[PDB]
Ligand binder design. Structure first.
Ligand SMILES: Nc1ncnc2c1ncn2[C@@H]1O[C@H](CSCC[C@H](N)C(=O)O)[C@@H](O)[C@H]1O
Ligand SMILES: CCCCCCCCO[C@@H]1O[C@H](CO)[C@@H](O)[C@H](O)[C@H]1O
Ligand SMILES: CCCCCCCCO[C@@H]1O[C@H](CO)[C@@H](O)[C@H](O)[C@H]1O
Ligand code: NA
Length: 466
């Protein structure tokens, strides 16, 4: 019965510690994952996350919210040193017991909100399921702190339950109470990505920094076993932001708390009822089972520059050709809507990732020695340069076939061939699909009652191979 006893940051801070207090009697993987059968998922999930990290030889790592330390255990195998923290005492105690055989782990009991360390004191800030237990202001404050603590070239890993609990709404799998309110913040995936990209931090030497969000990916184990695409994680690098201006906590908070979630909601309203893509009819006359063999993996790239509706229906692709699909998105809000679709369809063959550019996705897949079976893309030539397009082959099998739908103004077929021939393509054919696209786009808009105009561009449908 004290001042603002229902709403202060401390009361809200303590509501999370109280929630986790309920599990301190069970310092086990069930609590860490809030899943009655966490044994089924734990090792595969941990491997999904740990295999996404950079090598840690000679590096200092801080694992914040480490709990019983299932990541700490493996992180300290290669890192020079790991600081492992959690605000639940028994969890840290269980952490110290499991890891009694190791000698390069420091332990701390405390709230992540109050954690303090020297500038440029770590190389990796590792978290997994933590931001969702902080307020919007605390998330921003946490990220500015990570920025302070990281050395240049340093990384931060984050993984959050986005939009819904890991166990969905609501699985008997959950360890959540069916009657108690759940205090957890299930934010949209797009908000995390945008916040990370927005941050500009000036250090004590007066140097500016920004985050390079290397990727956004769904945790594979949660798709395969929980039909959940919204367990989202990101690897993010601290890099110089020459000439940029600082972003304050208040300036970031306005965006993160009000502006962005609002903008996301308008995109949900436009895209969530999408029954098919207007491009389906167009791609139908260029994609066959010679382009997409049965059980192959297709690489799909949809930047959605000219229009949010210009993309590839990856679900229809996977359905009609019995293939797996990786679809790259570059627009945060539109990537989120693809995750929404993925969760409702529950076709595990279809996967999405967010990257800043084509080059970003190519690096990711290069590092993983991927060789996709084909490419289907909208706006490839329109949005990417020769250098990036030429590097697509480094993630394609020999003779992989491609199909491109391209918005153009004047039709310059000779020039289009020369770009693609310069970027390593062969057997190039070009078909003008402007009238077909005009018909299909209008049919699609009227059918979905979108009060919008046509993209208004001409279209080429291109097929080639490498
Ligand atoms: N503000 C905070 N400071 C420190 N630890 C926190 C915290 N908020 C939540 N936690 C801890 O974060 C953990 C959440 S569950 C996930 C545990 C671990 N990251 C893993 O994936 O296995 C719990 O251990 C909880 O106690
Ligand atoms: C994203 C573009 C959607 C294209 C789907 C259109 C219908 C595809 O039709 C497919 O054609 C194949 C012939 O090669 C058959 O083997 C498949 O059984 C059939 O589903
Ligand atoms: C569903 C999408 C997730 C899988 C992404 C993996 C990247 C491509 O993986 C590739 O898949 C091919 C199978 O067609 C294999 O033959 C290749 O060896 C493999 O590199
Ligand atoms: Na989401």
């Amino acid at each position: 019965l004290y001042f603002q006893g229902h709403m202060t940051a401390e009361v809200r801070r303590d509501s999370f510690k109280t929630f986790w207090d309920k599990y301190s009697d069970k310092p086990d993987t069930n609590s860490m994952m809030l899943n009655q059968t966490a044994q089924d998922l734990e090792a595969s999930d941990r491997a999904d996350i740990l295999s996404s990290l950079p090598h840690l030889t000679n590096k200092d790592v801080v694992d914040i919210g480490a709990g019983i330390g299932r990541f700490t255990t493996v992180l300290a195998e290669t890192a020079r040193w790991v600081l492992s923290t959690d605000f639940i005492e028994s969890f840290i105690e269980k952490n110290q017991e499991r890891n009694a055989h190791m000698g390069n782990i420091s332990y701390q009991i405390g709230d992540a909100v109050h954690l303090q360390m020297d500038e440029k004191s770590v190389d990796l800030v590792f978290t997994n399921w933590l931001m969702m237990y902080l307020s919007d202001r605390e998330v921003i404050e946490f990220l500015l702190n990570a920025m302070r603590w990281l050395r240049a070239d340093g990384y931060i890993h984050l993984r959050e339950s986005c939009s819904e609990p890991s166990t969905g709404r609501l699985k008997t799998a959950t360890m959540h109470s069916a009657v108690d309110a759940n205090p957890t913040h299930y934010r949209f995936s797009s908000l995390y990505i945008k916040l990370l990209r927005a941050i500009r931090y000036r250090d004590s030497d007066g140097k500016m920094w920004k985050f390079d969000v290397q990727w956004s990916c769904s945790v594979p184990t949660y798709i395969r076993r929980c039909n959940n695409w919204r367990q989202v994680h990101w690897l993010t690098k601290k890099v110089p932001a020459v000439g940029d201006e600082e972003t304050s906590v208040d300036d970031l908070l306005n965006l993160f708390s009000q502006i962005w979630p609002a903008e996301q909601k308008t995109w949900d309203e436009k895209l969530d009822n999408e029954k098919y893509s207007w491009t389906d009819k167009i791609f139908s006359n260029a994609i066959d089972d010679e382009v997409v063999p049965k059980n192959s993996t297709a690489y799909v790239f949809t930047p959605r520059q000219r229009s949010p509706f210009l993309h590839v229906n990856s679900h229809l692709l996977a359905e009609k050709f019995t293939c797996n699909v990786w679809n790259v998105e570059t627009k945060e809000y539109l990537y989120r809507t693809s995750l929404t679709k993925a969760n409702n369809q529950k076709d595990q063959r279809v996967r999405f990732g967010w990257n800043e550019s084509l080059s970003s996705s190519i690096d990711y897949w290069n590092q993983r020695d991927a060789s996709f079976d084909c490419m289907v893309a909208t706006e490839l030539l329109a949005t990417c340069d020769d250098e990036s397009i030429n590097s697509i082959a480094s993630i394609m099998k020999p003779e992989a076939k491609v199909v491109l739908l391209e918005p153009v103004s004047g039709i310059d077929e000779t020039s289009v061939r020369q770009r693609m021939t310069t970027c390593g393509f062969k057997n190039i054919t070009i078909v003008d699909v402007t009238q077909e696209s005009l018909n299909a786009e209008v049919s699609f808009i009227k059918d979905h009652n979108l009060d919008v105009e046509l993209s208004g561009c001409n279209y080429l449908l291109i097929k080639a191979s490498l």
